[PDB]
């Protein structure tokens, strides 16, 4: 074509171009060798045989489409699908100086895991015999905003040592989460230029030791491995890239992040930028837009956890409705209008935020709403309200427990992935100052046909006895309650609830 690009720019301070036998492109030839027909002439001249010219790596574009090669700069809809592999990524760079001018080189690499890598300033040098990836002269960017980068110029490690560390960190983070690695970036240009130092691409490959997808490449072994088998590997293979700035944002990263989140604050380091970038991506994909058509595959004990949650819900709601003999039930957040317990004869009312059934209302509970349902009990199973009423039974997920189905979110919230992605607000204990912790207990009324527990409400336990029909059932409820509580769920009830009432029923 005719439009030139800044990619592979000659950054040397030489005043002359190269001879035709040494110049890589026609433009790079000194004009004394050129003729009118876009042809060069081998003049009788001496040549600067030994030379060293720094070449710019800024300006990459991975937009080419070749069959068999995956599309790495994925779109927003695929990023939402691959959310489990999201890693924030930020690079702070250094300016080439002394014998070169006009290119930037990575200095500090930060990831949303909270890890920073400091590297020596290394660039590409063209010589008379080939290319070199070697250390070059560099200086920190001028300005007070980059004053903390001055000490880092004396703490840089070599790139072949840092590549293995990056691969090891990523394998530790994502081994039980995903087979992929999606780098979430802001202003992806310098990020991609830095990614050229430690990433390799190609056709999709299988792990040499199992059936998982390969995520790391070994250049000494020339082999491919998944996260589990990637020990000693020195390249990330086929990562995805996402640019948050292309999702319709103006201004810089900091002002966009500070508008929605007040938790991710601290010193100016690349890791904080990466954390902020991932937080902004989470807010943009799961709070600004809530699309629940995306279904996520199971990776752990999730199906079992759902059934355990339903069992604990049935038992707790039965005990709460029975105790106190409240005949009015209000269920907030039910999208189907189906009661959990039916043995006590009580009136039922259903409410939801986005219902799809005319039987269920569209009420948005905020704070005033306490005196309107004062006559019954209010159900808040998996419903998030910053102020729960006095007469409520509430089940709230603790966002501080980390697991395979719980991911960091925005403003202290968490992304909970159970066949869907729900964003749950931060766990504030001041929202339960009007309620009490629910004690551990069991209640049943099944006919009967050793175990000893003081909280085991059972017709045999009224007289201090026990039977196998309830002995095994208490153990089953025990494992279900333990699974639910260790998964990150917490139960709250009205302050007048007590266990010893259940002896009368």
């Amino acid at each position: 074509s005719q439009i030139v690009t800044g990619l592979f720019k000659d950054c040397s301070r030489e005043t002359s171009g190269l001879s035709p036998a040494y110049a890589p492109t026609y433009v790079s030839v000194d004009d004394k060798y050129k003729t009118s027909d876009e042809l060069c002439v081998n003049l009788n001249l001496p040549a600067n045989v030994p030379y060293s010219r720094v070449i710019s790596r800024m300006g990459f574009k991975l937009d080419a489409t070749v069959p068999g090669y995956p599309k790495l700069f994925i779109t927003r809809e695929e990023a939402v699908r691959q959310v489990r592999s999201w890693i924030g990524f930020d690079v702070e760079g250094a300016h080439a100086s002394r014998n070169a001018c006009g290119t930037n080189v990575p200095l500090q690499l930060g990831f949303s895991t909270g890890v920073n890598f400091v590297v020596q300033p290394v660039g590409v040098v063209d010589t008379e015999w080939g290319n070199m990836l070697t250390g070059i002269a560099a200086r920190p960017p001028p300005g007070e905003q980059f004053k903390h980068l001055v000490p880092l110029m004396h703490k840089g490690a070599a790139w072949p040592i840092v590549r293995r560390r990056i691969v090891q960190m990523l394998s530790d983070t994502l081994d039980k989460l995903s087979d992929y690695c999606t780098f979430v970036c802001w202003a992806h240009g310098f990020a991609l230029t830095s990614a050229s130092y430690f990433c390799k691409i190609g056709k999709e490959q299988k792990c040499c030791m199992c059936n998982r997808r390969a995520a790391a490449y070994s250049s000494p072994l020339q082999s491919y491995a998944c996260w589990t088998h990637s020990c000693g590997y020195d390249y990330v293979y086929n990562p995805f890239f996402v640019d948050v700035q292309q999702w319709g944002y103006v201004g810089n990263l900091a002002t966009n992040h500070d508008r929605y989140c007040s938790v991710h604050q601290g010193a100016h380091v690349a890791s904080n930028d990466a954390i902020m970038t991932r937080c902004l991506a989470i807010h943009s994909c799961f709070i600004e837009r809530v699309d629940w058509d995306i279904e996520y595959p199971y990776i752990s004990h999730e199906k079992k956890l759902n059934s355990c949650c339903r069992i604990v819900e049935r038992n707790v709601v039965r005990a709460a409705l029975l105790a106190g003999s409240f005949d009015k039930v209000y269920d907030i957040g039910n999208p189907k209008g189906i009661p959990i317990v039916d043995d006590p004869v009580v009136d039922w009312h259903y409410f939801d935020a986005q219902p799809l059934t005319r039987k269920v209302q569209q009420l948005f509970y905020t704070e005033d709403m306490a005196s309107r349902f004062a006559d019954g009990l209010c159900l808040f199973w998996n419903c998030n309200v910053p102020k729960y009423p006095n007469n409520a039974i509430v089940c709230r997920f603790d966002t501080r427990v980390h697991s395979e189905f719980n991911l960091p979110g925005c403003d202290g919230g968490s992304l909970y992935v159970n066949k869907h992605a729900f964003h749950t607000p931060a766990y504030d204990v001041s929202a339960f100052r009007d309620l009490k912790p629910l004690p551990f207990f069991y209640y049943s009324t099944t006919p009967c046909e050793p175990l000893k527990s003081a909280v085991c409400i059972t017709a045999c336990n009224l007289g201090g006895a026990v039977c196998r029909k309830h002995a095994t059932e208490y153990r089953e409820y025990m494992e279900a309650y333990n699974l639910v509580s260790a998964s990150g769920f917490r139960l709250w009830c009205y302050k007048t609830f007590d266990i010893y009432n259940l002896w009368s029923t």
């Binding site: 074509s1 005719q2 439009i3 030139v4 690009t5 800044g6 990619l7 592979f8 720019k9 000659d10 950054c11 171009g17 035709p20 036998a21 040494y22 110049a23 890589p24 492109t25 026609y26 433009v27 790079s28 030839v29 003729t35 027909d37 876009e38 042809l39 060069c40 002439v41 081998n42 070449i55 710019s56 790596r57 300006g59 990459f60 574009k61 991975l62 937009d63 080419a64 070749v66 069959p67 068999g68 090669y69 001018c101 006009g102 290119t103 590409v124 063209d126 008379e128 015999w129 080939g130 290319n131 990836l133 050229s196 990433c199 390799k200 691409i201 190609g202 490449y217 293979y237």
Partner: protein
């Protein structure tokens, strides 16, 4: 600061070659899929009275060949990546390369897919008469 070297129309495939595990196969698959071959190669004015060998110190092109700069037709020099030779020295840089006139559409691809004969220094199948 600096002097520009490459066209934007060559920016994509070179970027691909800068990231692939095997650059040669990447370029060949890109071209064979309908991608545009590389341009901006250094072509030399030649009186067409040369000997016709593949790689030479001076331009030696016959009536059925064209002379290019050595670094211009090397994929590793164009993409500024590491050369595959164990010695680390490019066999093309600093010399002139003769390409058959029916393969001037993709000189870089021709140099990737062909090698000269060891004894006569002609292209194998394009001048090598070592029957």
């Amino acid at each position: 600061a600096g002097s520009n070297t490459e066209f934007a129309s060559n920016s994509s495939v070179l970027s691909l070659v800068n990231f692939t595990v095997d650059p040669q196969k990447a370029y060949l698959d890109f071209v064979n899929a309908g991608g545009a071959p590389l341009t901006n190669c250094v072509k030399m004015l030649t009186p067409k009275t040369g000997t016709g060998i593949a790689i030479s110190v001076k331009p030696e092109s016959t009536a059925d060949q064209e002379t290019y700069g050595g670094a211009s037709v090397c994929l590793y020099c164009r993409a500024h990546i590491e050369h595959p030779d164990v010695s680390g020295v490019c066999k093309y840089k600093g010399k002139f390369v003769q390409i058959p006139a029916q393969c001037v559409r993709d000189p870089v691809g021709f140099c990737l897919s062909n090698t000269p004969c060891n004894v006569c220094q002609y292209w194998i199948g394009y001048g090598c008469n070592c029957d």
